[PDB]
Design a protein around this ligand. Structure first.
Ligand code: Y01
Ligand code: Y01
Ligand code: Y01
Ligand code: Y01
Ligand code: Y01
Ligand code: Y01
Ligand code: A1AIB
Lengths: 251, 94, 52
């Protein structure tokens, strides 16, 4: 019976499923601690999450030490050649920074909460990473990678067109705003949600002069709005339809 | 999609609304808001409401527009197009 | 005044054009140039689409 239980629990598939179940429980307790409170001292669930992170860091150090090269900088560079190890180490230092900030008093506790939320984001991306075992999800994952590269180039071209329209809009309308960083907020705010649905129907050609007087060229903003969203939405979004279709053939 | 949407909803409902006690309505919010965010309506009133000018701003209230932009961007475009390619390559065999 | 605001309007539409020139300069990159000729041919096809 001892040989039976020892032969079962050392199997790699058993190790994979046990690690996946523990990761699922980790993501559960992380959700619980980012929704439910924290005080001057952490709760038991948050102490468990801290224990999870620190033992993962210890295991990553064991991965670094027990590798194939024999020189320290060589094996550190070999371990850091993988991208997921790099982002894992970045997240471990992020969680330790957030835990140091959260163990201090206010206002550092809310900053630690913010770091905890962006680490949640990363650990859900790690759950996406683990989906390479499934034969139906792995192709979708490499789609996410190649489509992300093609959307990086798309985001460059979209960013040029959207930034030009936003600069033109915020320079025609609102013609009396002094130097402030909120101008960049407006020019990146308004067209970006304009693409994705909501066209801000109240904000386009409001009745003026019937009410404040009309700014000069206030009729030009509906025309450049029509031209911008038209070519933006249809030309680039369809373009990405064609791009992602011709990526899927090779993948 | 459920992984990505759930992560964004958890991040949003943990940054904004930072003082909700244990209740099952938290799951309602995190599955409520991004799911209708995908499909059209972006909830323009709820994104970056003016604070501090009005209740004071929660810490990191500016991070929610950034992660909103990043989430819906990769969500809508990456996965929806992905499904364009998927359903096209299904139609050939059928 | 009121010619100054008209000059401002012309300045904004010239901004529009100079961002399109920044789009023009992207023909050096091997990954952006194909997207640029997509913009051209898709613009012609959308001209006929815009008619219908
Ligand atoms: C071309 C792409 C890649 C980037 C486009 C960025 C612009 C939207 C930025 C870059 C330069 C920025 C300006 C740089 C300097 C200032 C002064 C700044 O003034 C202050 O912060 C007050 C104190 C001071 O005047 O130093 C207000 C924002 C503003 C007008 C910025 C507005 C936004 C601008 C135009
Ligand atoms: C080449 C491509 C892939 C670059 C993509 C990234 C940029 C589009 C991002 C990254 C950093 C961003 C900037 C980071 C910080 C700010 C300050 C922000 O200022 C305010 O909102 C005013 C102050 C406030 O109200 O908080 C305005 C947007 C801006 C310029 C952001 C505009 C968009 C930027 C340039
Ligand atoms: C591209 C094809 C398929 C459709 C054609 C679309 C455009 C040619 C239309 C759509 C919206 C229209 C605009 C909607 C509103 C106005 C504002 C109007 O000015 C006013 O009402 C007074 C000034 C103001 O209150 O803004 C001048 C016409 C204009 C620019 C229209 C011009 C023609 C536009 C750009
Ligand atoms: C990872 C995927 C597959 C599922 C994600 C589910 C989460 C959104 C759920 C699962 C665990 C849930 C928590 C489990 C326990 C509780 C206690 C619960 O408290 C009560 O109902 C009051 C009585 C009591 O405390 O027992 C309130 C909801 C809450 C915080 C839940 C909030 C929503 C959570 C984080
Ligand atoms: C692997 C994939 C395909 C699973 C897909 C199904 C889940 C995404 C669904 C099925 C059961 C659902 C849960 C069923 C019941 C509730 C309780 C609900 O609680 C409330 O709304 C609070 C009480 C109230 O106001 O009625 C919050 C959503 C939640 C957790 C649901 C979240 C979404 C769940 C997990
Ligand atoms: C991806 C390409 C094609 C376009 C670039 C999109 C983003 C880089 C833009 C779109 C929305 C922008 C955000 C819109 C609003 C805000 C809130 C702003 O903070 C405030 O106004 C003060 C705090 C608050 O009231 O929330 C800081 C900049 C930020 C995050 C902006 C940063 C830059 C963002 C994420
Ligand atoms: C905290 C925390 C993270 C974590 N999980 C992992 O980071 C990860 C994993 C994720 C999902 C399923 C199975 C494992 N994992 C744990 C041990 C080191 C390692 C090496 C290569 C690949 C994965 C992996 N558990 O607690």
């Amino acid at each position: 019976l001892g040989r039976k239980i020892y032969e079962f629990y050392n199997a790699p598939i058993v190790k994979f499923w046990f690690y996946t179940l523990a990761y699922i429980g980790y993501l559960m307790l992380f959700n619980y601690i980012v929704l439910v409170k924290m005080e001057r001292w952490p709760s038991t669930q948050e102490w468990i999450v801290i224990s999870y992170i620190f033992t993962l860091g210890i295991e990553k150090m064991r991965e670094i030490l027990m590798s194939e090269p024999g020189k320290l900088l060589q094996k550190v560079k070999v371990w850091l050649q993988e991208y997921w190890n790099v982002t894992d180490l970045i997240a471990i230092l992020l969680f330790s920074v957030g835990m140091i900030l959260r163990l201090q008093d206010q206002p550092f506790r809310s900053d630690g909460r913010v770091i905890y939320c962006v680490n949640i984001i990363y650990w859900y991306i790690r759950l996406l990473d683990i989906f390479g075992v499934n034969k139906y999800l792995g192709p979708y994952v490499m789609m996410i990678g190649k489509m992300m590269i093609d959307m990086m180039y798309f985001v460059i071209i979209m960013l040029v067109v959207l930034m030009s329209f936003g600069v033109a809009r915020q320079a025609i309308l609102f013609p009396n705003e002094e130097p402030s960083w909120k101008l960049a907020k407006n020019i990146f705010y308004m067209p970006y949600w304009m693409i994705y649905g909501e066209v801000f129907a109240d904000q386009i050609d409001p009745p003026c002069g019937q009410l404040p007087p009309c700014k000069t060229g206030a009729w030009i903003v509906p025309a450049i709005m029509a031209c911008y969203l038209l070519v933006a939405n249809i030309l680039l979004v369809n373009l990405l339809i064609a791009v992602f279709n011709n990526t899927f053939f090779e993948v």
